[PDB]
């Protein structure tokens, strides 16, 4: 069973034990509902919105302006809020080829900022998502192997350096990373 | 359309039918 | 006379089976031959008194 | 014709005697006519508990009877008293005309109508239900359904694969009372070295059965081109065999008699076996916290007898040519070196280069795997907690580097020579630190270099360039050092 | 092209393992053997050659045997050889139509043959009983056809005809040795089996030095010498089955494909001996009939004369085989002409068959050029010139060796003819080599 | 495990509870998105299942089950499209592309939300000791 709110127009499951698939589906239905309530035209178009993009760009630029001011802690917070707004206040039917590149372009700077700050697990998870969503470049494996070496995982670091060199064998930084990985692993094994 | 087990069943059924016909024709003469 | 000459030349060029292969060959073929012959002989032998009683 | 049956027992004795001799003779003739050292075979049964010994324990007269029957029949023959042709038969008379006349025909009808089709159908339905790998059809269907709807965001672990295994249909045929939750609980009890209390004889059965299940799961996961699930299955196989949960310091916790509460609390830098063997023979015992010489010798003998791998030369080879050309069929040829965790590194330049080359003869290039198929088998492993007895194994699988997908089913090797682990080469120690290659006992021809050849299953691409691969050779018994290398084929035309 | 909806066994979608094939072969053989021992119900022209060649016995449900199937197969083989059907490999629907026309004509042939045998045979003219007696043969022939189709679709180790013929040959060989029947002609009871009578005379006679020489010769019934000779000939034929010429070949379309192409000694083993046997059987039958019908004619006297029955003083007398060494030592000219004829016939038949069946060296060279393979140490333009030096000699010598083996077997007096032993051996060796090259238990 | 019956449950609830009109369109769009996702999934999974079957590692009835699901998905999508036409007039050509986009968008959103749970599994598995601010304190 599942109850329907009156003033909020959001459906919730009144049961005590609900599966995971049912919860994900009810959440998706709530998202679609609260988007359709706001979008006024009945024949909506996959054309992206403009005011939302302007606000997201404003937040991202206000976050980037702190880098010139040499404030490294709150710029990360502003970029995180920008990414959250881009993931929250955007309708699902908007174009994919315009919704994914903005996420990449913001997540890249957030990764750089987390790596400069000193958080390596958050940065590693961001690299893993950005790599598994369809962005494979030699500038990703450098940072991923850097993180894996900073938190002491040497077999995975070696595999990452090898796969990074299998795509751009002329890179000058992945080679030094591979040398360091081999040295650390030889000290770890013997 | 037809499985191997169907062929085996058909063959055994035909053989048993012929044998039963023979033994029935043999016992009918002995009965009368 | 040249017929036998070509024959013996071809025979000298062939590949004859050695012991470790001939034993496997004779084992397989003999087991198959016996497995067929015993089945045939048993089916032929059993059906004589059955055919006497039934028919 | 019109036969005449034996009415005085004058012919069937000889027929039965011949039928008996033709079976007795060959059996009597047959009865009158009738490389890899294992060190753990003795040390394993000394550490196995009695509860597993009891499980492993619990779960010619034809010739003599034929000869005595032959003697009886021969004495009976000797005890007997003895123009157109009158044909006859050898069978006795009461078999066809006495009081046993309908018994023969009813036995024929029964044995032809009931026993034959029933048993044929039973055999057919029993042989049609299993998969060519060796698992049930329902089990394979469950595995395929598990891998069809699998969220790539979820991370694979050991608990996930145990939860997947607990739904096997073959666990239900053994004990129809238990539920999959009970099977998952028993598997967790086994891995975490816990006491089930009452269902030990079911824990042992399902644990011994998980072998074929994990092999079939690995096969299916490689068939769906999934690398993470394959690696997880191999790691779970290791954990099930060694009865230990997967942790960072596991190579040193698989050892026979250590106490985790002391080792984990005291030291935190020893993670492998080489790092352990860096220390002296008494410091190792003091660190592992056992302090018993007669009991330290056994763990030091186990810790320096498990195999580690190392490559000497790896490259792609095509049989009969000198290079890789577009649309040709190459394979992978590896020269590995099975070494102990205690021995130092020998430079690759010391190899005489004579053991690494391939012979170029037609009998050798018609099939390049016959020379690999001559190596000795792998010895018995040291697994005191696994119910049955296992031989070692190495599972080698190859994938791509552009997309990262497994591109063929895994090859499982079983023949390899562990000659470099024998105790005659004990001078070659890591702690002596005196450049033991210039030693009076060191001869570079005594060390063996094994070979591994993996068929590639796909021809070279029609283009020209360098295409990189990734080969992984993992063990299925220990937590040793595996192989993980990348190599490229230079299709050059 | 037409419409056809008739029962047929469906082929397996995947490969069947070796054990599931062996068990099905055994079960089909058991059914086919049980079918031929049960007589008909309505029962109340002896052609022994046809019943011995086509796996048939009279007075049982297996009277026709595989005769209609083999006749339809030969008819369509001739129709395809004469290029009248013009079957092209570019279409599969045409092949399916041909394969279904095979059965739709075979069933009509079965019906016609059954009607002819019932209306003409020695069963008797006097209607429902006749309908039942025809329906029995109908259903038995349908079952035999379904069994052959099952064994040929993929559930069996091979075809059905060869398996059934080899089974009959082996059954005859074993019944001539372990027969439990006896014969009483003045002297007493004597078994019709070699080993049975051997043991009987060794046990009951109590005169071993005489029982041995009496049971070993047995001029009237099978003895032990024939058993020894047939075992020796079996082993020798099994040894001459492994002879093969292996020339090394390599590929050029996809490199890295090295192999070996074998050219056996028994290149066309089964064809020449069976064709020659059928020819001699038909000639003997025609000569016997023409000699029986006519009392005396010059040309009829020349072709063949029969007397105490066996042919003598005629053309058919020369072609008839020698019984034992006595007939050989008696008249040398007959032995010379018989050996020359039987060897030349086999050699010429083997050469003609390799020229007809499409296995000539030129066709093999065309297939080599098609697949792209070459000979290892030779050029491209020389594969045909090399095969011409190998294949014809192989065929000729295989035929000559088969003929010599048949003559030696029929002369040494074995339990069965050399043709039968060789055919059964080749049929079983085919299954053995298939299981070996494919890989199975 | 589907969003098929959830739409029917909401539909049956609509006739009694007087729910809004856009909730039905939301559930319908979700069902169409799931149908498109499943169709693409089967379209990419067909060759691997076929090869596993030909090799002899899947059984004989699972292949028939797969070939039946292949057309069951098309039947369900046609039913969804007919219902879409019924619910709003002249909304059949845009419905399909809108569903095609929401499929990818919601899959990406799921993958992005999964990282918060993905982050603690690795801590548990590698025994990391991390204080506040995400730094390592060994």
The residue ranges of every structural domain in chain D are 137-303, 311-430+442-491
State the Cα–Cα distance between residues E343 and E323, nearest whole angstrom: 18
Residues 6+ apart with CB under 8 A from E18: E435, E438, E440, E441
Residues of D with CB under 8 A from a CB of E: 3, 10-11, 14-15, 17-18, 21-22, 74, 77-78, 80, 82-91, 112, 120, 123, 127, 132, 318-321, 325, 327-330, 362, 365-366, 459
Residues 6+ apart with CB under 8 A from D267: D287
Residue in chain B closest to E25 (alpha carbons) equals: B4
State the Cα–Cα distance between residues A61 and A55, nearest whole angstrom: 10
Distance of CA D297 to the CA centre of its chain: 29
Residues 6+ apart with CB under 8 A from A8: none
CA-wise closest residue to D305 among D386, D192, D422: D422
Distances (CA, A) of D369 to D330, D365, D373, E78: 13, 9, 6, 47
State the Cα–Cα distance between residues D109 and C54, nearest whole angstrom: 11
Query: Phi, psi at residue D314, to the nearest 5°?
Result: -135, 135
> Can you name the residues that pair with E39 across neighbouring β-strands?
E60
Query: Please, which chains are in contact with B (at least 3 CB pairs closer than 8 A)?
Result: C, D, E
Q: A70-81: buried (b, 16+ CB within 10 Å) or exposed (e) per residue? A: eeeeebbebbbe
Return the HEC string of chain E. Answer: CCCCCCCCECCCCCCCCHHHHHHHHHHHHHHHHHHCCCECCCCCCCCHHHHHHCCCCCCECCCCCCHHHHHHHHHHHHHHHCCCCCCCCCCCHHHHHHHHHHHHHHHHHHHHHHHHHHHHCCCCCCCHHHHHHHHHHHHHHHHHHHHHHHHHHHHCCCCCHHHHHHHHHHHHHHHCCCCCCEEECCCCEEECCHHHHHHHHHHHCCCHHHHHHHHHHCCCCCCHHHHHHHHHHHHHHHHCCCCEEEEEEEECCCCCCEEEEEEECCCCCHHHHHHHHHHHHHHHHHHHHHHHHCCCCHHHHHHCCEECCEECCCHHHHHCCCCCHHHHHHCHHHHHHHHHHHHHHHHHHHHHHHHHCCCCHHHHHHHHHHHCEEECCCCCCCHHHHHCCCHHHHHHHHHHHHHHHHHHHHHHCCCCCHHHHHHHHHHHHHHHHHHHHHCCC
Q: Show the CA angle centred on residue D229, arms to residues D224 and D232, nearest 5°.
A: 155
Contact E183 D91 (CB under 8 A): no
Contact E203 D77 (CB under 8 A): yes
Asked if residue E233 lies in contact with residue E409, where contact means CB atoms within 8 angstroms, the answer is yes
Which DSSP helix (H) or strand (E) runs through F120? helix F115-126
Contact B4 E61 (CB under 8 A): no
Q: Could you give the dihedral angle defined by the CA atoms of residues A19, A25, A26 and A32, in that order, rounded to the nearest 10 degrees?
A: 170
User: What's the gap in Å between the CA of B2 and the closest CA on chain D?
Assistant: 15
State the Cα–Cα distance between residues D250 and D119, nearest whole angstrom: 51
Residue carrying structure tokens 């009970």: D182
Chains F and C physically touch (3 or more Cβ atom pairs below 8 Å): no
Return the HEC string of chain D. Answer: CCCCCECCCCCHHHHHHHHHHHHHHHHHHHHHHCCCCCCHHHHHHCCCCHHHHHHHHHCCHHHHHHHHHHHHHHHHHHHCCCCCCCCECCCECCCCCCCCHHHHHHHHHHHHHCHHHHHHHHHHHHHCCECCCCCEHHHHHHHHHHHHCCCCCCCCCHHHHHHHHCCCCHHHHHCCCCCHHHHHHHHHHHHCCCCCCCCHHHHHHHHHHHHHHHHHHHHHHHHCCCHHHHHHHHHHHHHHHHCCCCCCCCCCCCCCCCCHHHHHHHCCCCCCHHHHHCCCHHHHHHHHCCCCHHHHHHHHHHHCCCCECCEEEEEEECCCCCCCCCCCCCEEEEEECCECCCCCCCCHHHCCCCCCCCCCCHHHHCCCCCCHHHCCECCECCCCCCCCCCECCEEEEEEECCCCCECCCCEEECECCCHHHCCCCCCCCCCCCCCHHHCCCCCCCCCCCEEEEEECCCCCCCCCEEEEEEEEEEECCCCCCCEEEEEEEEECC
Residue carrying structure tokens 């998202």: A31
Contact A22 F126 (CB under 8 A): no
Counting Cα atoms < 13 Å in the Cβ hemisphere of D220 gives 28
Q: Which candidate from D105, D109, D117 shows the least CB-CB separation from B9?
A: D117
**CA dihedral over C15, C16, C20, C25, signed as positive or negative:** positive
Residue in chain B closest to E28 (alpha carbons) equals: B8
> Can you name the residues that pair with D485 across neighbouring β-strands?
D471
Distance of CA E65 to the CA centre of its chain: 14
Q: Show the CA angle centred on residue F131, arms to residues F125 and F137, nearest 5°.
A: 80
State the Cα–Cα distance between residues D436 and D424, nearest whole angstrom: 15
State the Cα–Cα distance between residues E222 and E216, nearest whole angstrom: 9
Contact F130 A121 (CB under 8 A): yes
Query: Phi, psi at residue D425, to the nearest 5°?
Result: -100, 65
Counting Cα atoms < 13 Å in the Cβ hemisphere of D360 gives 6
CA-wise closest residue to F32 among F109, F94, F112: F94
Residue carrying structure tokens 């996959």: A46
A 10 A CB-CB count for E164 gives 25
Q: Does B21 touch chain C (CB under 8 A)?
A: no
| F73 SS3 class | helix
User: What's the gap in Å between the CA of D196 and the closest CA on chain A?
Assistant: 30
Domain ranges of chain E: 18-177+228-438
Domain ranges of chain F: 1-138
Name the method of structure determination. Answer: cryo-EM
- Name the resolution in angstroms: 3.1
Long-range residue pairs from A84-88, CB within 8 A, at least 24 positions apart, any chain: A85/A55, A85/A56, A85/A59, A86/A56, A87/F109, A87/F112
Chains F and A physically touch (3 or more Cβ atom pairs below 8 Å): yes
Residue F136 DSSP class: B
Asked if residue E438 lies in contact with residue E15, where contact means CB atoms within 8 angstroms, the answer is no
Residues 6+ apart with CB under 8 A from E416: E169, E172, E173, E176, E230
| A180 SS3 class | helix
Distances (CA, A) of D337 to D310, D418, E373: 5, 9, 39
State the Cα–Cα distance between residues D127 and D375, nearest whole angstrom: 34
CA-wise closest residue to E98 among E131, E114, E76, E117: E76
**CA dihedral over D427, D430, D432, D436, signed as positive or negative:** positive
Residue A92 DSSP class: T
State the Cα–Cα distance between residues F22 and A41, nearest whole angstrom: 12
Domain ranges of chain A: 1-190
State the Cα–Cα distance between residues E410 and E49, nearest whole angstrom: 17
Residues 328-367 of chain D whose Cβ lies under 8 A from any Cβ of chain C: none
Q: Is F80 exposed, middle or buried (0-12, 13-18, 19+ CB in 10 A)?
A: buried
Distance of CA E395 to the CA centre of its chain: 19
Residues 6+ apart with CB under 8 A from F105: A92, A93, A94, A96, A99
Asked if residue D414 lies in contact with residue D327, where contact means CB atoms within 8 angstroms, the answer is no
Tell me which of F2, F58, F116, F125 to substitute to probe the interface with D (most D C-beta atoms closer than 10 Å): F58
F18: left (phi over 0), alpha (psi -120 to 50) or beta: left
State the Cα–Cα distance between residues E243 and E226, nearest whole angstrom: 27
CA-wise closest residue to D96 among D11, D7, D16: D7
State the Cα–Cα distance between residues E391 and D6, nearest whole angstrom: 59
Asked if residue D433 lies in contact with residue D280, where contact means CB atoms within 8 angstroms, the answer is no
Asked if residue D389 lies in contact with residue D375, where contact means CB atoms within 8 angstroms, the answer is no
State the Cα–Cα distance between residues E289 and E292, nearest whole angstrom: 5
State the Cα–Cα distance between residues F95 and F28, nearest whole angstrom: 10
Contact C49 D108 (CB under 8 A): no
Query: Alpha helices, DSSP H only, in chain A?
Result: 20-38, 51-68, 74-88, 96-117, 121-132, 138-150, 154-165, 173-189
Contact D112 B12 (CB under 8 A): yes
Query: Phi, psi at residue D211, to the nearest 5°?
Result: -60, -60
Which DSSP helix (H) or strand (E) runs through A11? strand A11-12
Asked if residue E172 lies in contact with residue D81, where contact means CB atoms within 8 angstroms, the answer is no
Query: Please, which chains are in contact with A (at least 3 CB pairs closer than 8 A)?
Result: D, F
Q: Could you give the dihedral angle defined by the CA atoms of residues D143, D147, D151 and D156, in that order, rounded to the nearest 10 degrees?
A: 70
Residue in chain E closest to F57 (alpha carbons) equals: E14
State the Cα–Cα distance between residues D107 and E425, nearest whole angstrom: 36
User: What's the gap in Å between the CA of D105 and the closest CA on chain C?
Assistant: 6
Q: F4-17 and A20-38 helices cross at what angle (nearest 10)?
A: 60
User: What's the gap in Å between the CA of D299 and the closest CA on chain F?
Assistant: 26
Q: Which candidate from D105, D116, D124 shows the least CB-CB separation from B12?
A: D116
Residue carrying structure tokens 């795509």: A167
Q: Show the CA angle centred on residue D199, arms to residues D196 and D200, nearest 5°.
A: 70
CA-wise closest residue to D150 among D229, D212, D219: D229
Contact F26 A95 (CB under 8 A): no
State the Cα–Cα distance between residues D220 and D215, nearest whole angstrom: 9
State the Cα–Cα distance between residues E276 and E270, nearest whole angstrom: 11
> Can you name the residues that pair with D314 across neighbouring β-strands?
D334
Q: Which two tokens stand for residue E50?
A: 């046809």
Distances (CA, A) of E112 to D90, E40, E53, E64, E67: 42, 19, 21, 12, 12
Asked if residue D27 lies in contact with residue D62, where contact means CB atoms within 8 angstroms, the answer is yes
Statement: D137-303 belongs to CATH 1.10.3470: no
CA-wise closest residue to D379 among D393, D368, D366, D364: D393
Asked if residue D93 lies in contact with residue E195, where contact means CB atoms within 8 angstroms, the answer is no
Contact A119 F1 (CB under 8 A): no
Domains contained in chain B, number: 1
State the Cα–Cα distance between residues E27 and E17, nearest whole angstrom: 16
Asked if residue E216 lies in contact with residue E224, where contact means CB atoms within 8 angstroms, the answer is yes
The CATH number for D311-430+442-491, chosen from 3.50.30.40, 2.40.50.220, 2.60.40.150, 2.60.40.10, is 2.60.40.150
State the Cα–Cα distance between residues E94 and F32, nearest whole angstrom: 46
Residue A39 DSSP class: -
Distances (CA, A) of C30 to C38, D179, D412, E270: 12, 52, 36, 20
Q: Show the CA angle centred on residue D306, arms to residues D300 and D310, nearest 5°.
A: 125
Asked if residue E141 lies in contact with residue B1, where contact means CB atoms within 8 angstroms, the answer is no
| A166 SS3 class | coil
Q: Show the CA angle centred on residue E341, arms to residues E335 and E343, nearest 5°.
A: 100
| B7 SS3 class | helix
Q: Which residues of E touch B26 (CB under 8 A)?
A: none
Q: Which candidate from A158, A166, A188 shows the least CB-CB separation from D468?
A: A166
D404: left (phi over 0), alpha (psi -120 to 50) or beta: left
Residue in chain D closest to A152 (alpha carbons) equals: D248
**CA dihedral over E396, E401, E406, E411, signed as positive or negative:** positive
* Sheet bearing E373-375, strands edge to edge: E258-264, E244-251, E373-375
Residue F132 DSSP class: G
């Amino acid at each position: 069973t599942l109850e329907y709110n009156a003033n909020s127009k959001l459906i919730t499951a009144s049961d005590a034990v609900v599966a995971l698939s049912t919860e994900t589906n009810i959440d998706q239905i709530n998202v679609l509902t609260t988007s359709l309530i706001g979008e006024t035209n009945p024949n909506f178009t996959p054309q992206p919105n403009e005011a939302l993009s302007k606000m997201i760009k404003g937040l991202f630029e206000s976050g980037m302006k702190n880098l010139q001011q040499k404030k490294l802690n709150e710029a990360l917070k502003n970029v995180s809020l920008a990414i959250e707004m881009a993931q929250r206040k955007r309708a699902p039917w908007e174009a994919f080829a315009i919704q994914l590149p903005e996420l990449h372009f913001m997540l890249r700077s957030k990764i750089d900022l987390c790596l400069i700050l000193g958080k390596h697990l958050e940065a590693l998870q961001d690299l893993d998502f950005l790599l598994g969503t369809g962005l494979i470049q030699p500038d990703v494996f450098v940072r991923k192997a850097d993180c894996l070496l900073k938190l002491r995982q040497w077999e995975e670091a070696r595999a990452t350096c090898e796969r990074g060199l299998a795509l751009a064998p002329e890179d000058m930084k992945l080679r030094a990373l591979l040398i360091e990985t081999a040295r650390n692993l030889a000290e770890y094994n013997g | 359309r037809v499985d191997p087990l169907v062929v085996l069943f058909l063959a055994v059924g035909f053989i048993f039918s012929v044998v039963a016909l023979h033994v029935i024709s043999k016992v009918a003469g002995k009965l009368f | 006379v040249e017929f036998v000459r070509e024959g013996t030349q071809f025979l000298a060029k062939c590949k004859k089976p050695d012991l470790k292969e001939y034993t496997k060959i004779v084992k397989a073929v003999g087991i198959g031959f016996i497995a067929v012959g015993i089945i045939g002989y048993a089916i032929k032998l059993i059906h004589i008194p059955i055919r006497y009683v039934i028919v | 014709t019109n036969y005449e049956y034996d009415e005085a027992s004058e012919t069937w004795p000889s027929f039965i005697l011949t039928g008996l001799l033709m079976v007795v003779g060959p059996m009597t003739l047959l009865q009158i006519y009738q490389f890899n050292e294992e060190v753990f075979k003795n040390l394993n049964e000394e550490y196995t508990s009695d509860e597993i010994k009891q499980f492993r324990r619990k779960f010619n007269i034809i010739i003599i009877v034929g000869w005595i029957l032959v003697a009886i029949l021969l004495q009976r023959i000797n005890s007997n008293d003895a123009q157109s042709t009158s044909h006859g038969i050898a069978l006795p008379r009461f078999l066809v005309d006495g009081s046993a006349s309908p018994l023969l025909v009813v036995c024929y009808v029964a044995l032809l109508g009931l026993i034959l089709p029933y048993f044929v159908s039973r055999w057919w339905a029993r042989t049609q239900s299993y998969t060519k790998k060796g698992i049930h059809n329902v089990t394979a269907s469950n595995f395929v359904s598990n891998l069809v709807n699998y969220k790539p965001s979820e991370i694979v672990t050991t608990d996930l694969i145990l939860h997947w295994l607990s739904f096997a249909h073959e666990f239900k045929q053994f004990f129809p009372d238990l539920q999959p939750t009970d099977f998952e609980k028993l598997l967790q009890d086994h891995i975490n070295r816990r006491d089930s209390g009452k269902l030990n004889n079911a824990k042992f059965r399902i644990v011994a059965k998980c072998h074929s299940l994990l092999h079939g799961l690995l096969d299916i996961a490689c068939g769906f081109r999934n690398l993470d699930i394959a690696l997880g299955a191999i790691n779970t196989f290791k954990c099930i065999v060694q009865a230990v949960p997967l942790t960072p310091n596991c190579q040193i916790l698989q050892l026979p008699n250590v106490d985790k509460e002391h080792f984990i609390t005291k030291t935190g830098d020893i993670h492998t076996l080489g790092k352990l063997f860096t220390l002296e023979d008494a410091k190792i015992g003091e660190v592992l916290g056992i302090k018993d010489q007669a009991k330290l010798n056994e763990t030091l003998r186990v810790a320096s007898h498990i195999p580690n791998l190392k490559i000497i030369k790896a490259d792609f080879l095509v049989p009969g040519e000198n290079q890789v050309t577009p649309s040709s069929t190459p394979y992978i040829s590896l020269k590995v070196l099975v070494r102990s965790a205690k021995q130092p590194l020998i430079p690759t330049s010391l190899i005489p280069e004579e053991n690494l080359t391939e012979p170029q003869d037609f009998e050798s290039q018609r099939d390049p795997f016959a020379m690999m198929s001559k190596q000795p088998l792998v010895p018995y492993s040291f697994a005191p907690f696994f119910p049955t007895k296992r031989r070692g194994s190495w599972c080698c699988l190859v994938s791509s580097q552009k997309d990262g997908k497994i591109l063929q089913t895994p090859i499982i090797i079983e023949k390899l020579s562990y000659k470099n682990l024998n105790d005659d080469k004990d001078f070659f120690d890591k702690r002596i630190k005196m450049d033991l290659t210039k030693h009076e006992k060191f001869d570079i021809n005594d060390w063996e270099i094994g070979t591994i050849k993996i068929p590639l299953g796909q021809p070279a691409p029609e283009t020209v360039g360098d295409f990189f691969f990734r080969v992984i050779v993992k063990s299925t018994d220990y937590f040793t050092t595996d192989l993980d290398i990348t190599m490229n084929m230079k299709v050059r035309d | 092209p037409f419409e056809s909806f008739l029962p047929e066994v469906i082929a397996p979608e995947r490969k069947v393992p070796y054990n599931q094939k062996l068990i099905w072969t055994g079960v089909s053989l058991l059914i086919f053997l049980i079918l031929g021992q049960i007589p008909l119900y309505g029962i109340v022209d002896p052609l022994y050659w046809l019943r011995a060649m086509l796996a048939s016995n009279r007075g049982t449900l297996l009277e026709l045997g595989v005769s209609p199937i083999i006749t339809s197969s030969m008819i369509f083989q001739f129709l395809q050889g004469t290029q009248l059907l013009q079957i092209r490999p570019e279409s599969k629907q045409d092949r399916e139509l041909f394969q279904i026309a095979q059965k739709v004509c075979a069933i009509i042939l079965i019906l016609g043959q059954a009607l002819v045998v019932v209306m003409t045979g020695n069963y008797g003219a006097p209607l429902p009983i006749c309908l039942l007696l025809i329906f029995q043969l109908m259903f038995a022939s349908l079952i035999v056809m379904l069994l052959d189709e099952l064994l040929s679709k993929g559930y069996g180790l091979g075809s059905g005809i060869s398996l059934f013929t080899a089974t009959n040959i082996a059954e005859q060989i074993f019944w001539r040795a372990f027969a439990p029947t006896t014969v009483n002609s003045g002297r007493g009871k004597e078994f019709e089996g070699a080993v049975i009578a051997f043991f009987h005379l060794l046990a009951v006679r109590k005169d071993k030095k005489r029982a041995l020489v009496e049971a070993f010769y047995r001029t009237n019934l099978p003895n032990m010498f024939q058993v020894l000779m047939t075992v020796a000939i079996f082993l020798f034929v099994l040894y001459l089955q492994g002879f093969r010429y292996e020339l090394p070949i390599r590929s050029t379309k996809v490199r890295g494909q090295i192999g070996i192409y074998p050219i056996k000694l028994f290149y066309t083993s089964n064809t020449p001996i069976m064709l020659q046997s059928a020819l001699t059987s038909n000639i003997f039958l025609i000569s016997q009939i023409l000699f029986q019908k006519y009392p005396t004619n010059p040309l009829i006297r020349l072709i063949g004369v029969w007397g105490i029955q066996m042919a003598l003083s005629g053309l058919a007398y020369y072609i008839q085989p020698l019984m034992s060494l006595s007939e050989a030592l008696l008249d040398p000219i007959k032995t010379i002409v018989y050996i020359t004829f039987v060897l030349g016939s086999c050699a010429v038949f083997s050469k003609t068959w390799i020229e007809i069946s499409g296995t000539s060296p030129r066709d093999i060279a065309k297939q080599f050029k098609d697949q792209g393979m070459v000979i290892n140490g030779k050029r491209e333009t020389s594969i045909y010139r090399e095969l011409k030096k190998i294949i014809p000699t192989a065929a000729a010598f295989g035929g000559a060796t088969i003929g010599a083996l048949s003559v030696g077997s029929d002369l040494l007096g074995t339990l069965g003819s050399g043709a039968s032993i060789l055919m059964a051996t080749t049929t079983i060796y085919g299954y053995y080599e298939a299981a070996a090259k494919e890989g199975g238990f | 495990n589907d969003a098929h019956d959830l739409y029917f449950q909401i539909k049956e609830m609509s006739e009694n509870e007087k729910i809004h009109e856009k909730v039905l369109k939301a559930a319908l769009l979700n069902r169409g998105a799931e149908s498109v996702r499943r169709s693409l999934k089967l379209k990419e999974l067909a060759p691997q299942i076929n090869l596993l079957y030909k090799n002899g590692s899947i059984g004989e009835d699972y292949w028939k089950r797969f070939e039946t699901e292949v057309k069951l998905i098309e039947l369900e999508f046609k039913d969804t499209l007919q219902e879409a036409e019924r619910l709003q007039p002249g909304w059949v050509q845009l419905f399909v592309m809108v569903c095609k986009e929401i499929c990818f968008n919601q899959a990406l959103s799921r993958r992005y939300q999964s990282i918060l749970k993905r982050k603690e599994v690795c801590i548990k598995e590698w025994e990391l000791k991390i204080n506040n601010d995400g730094r390592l304190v060994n």
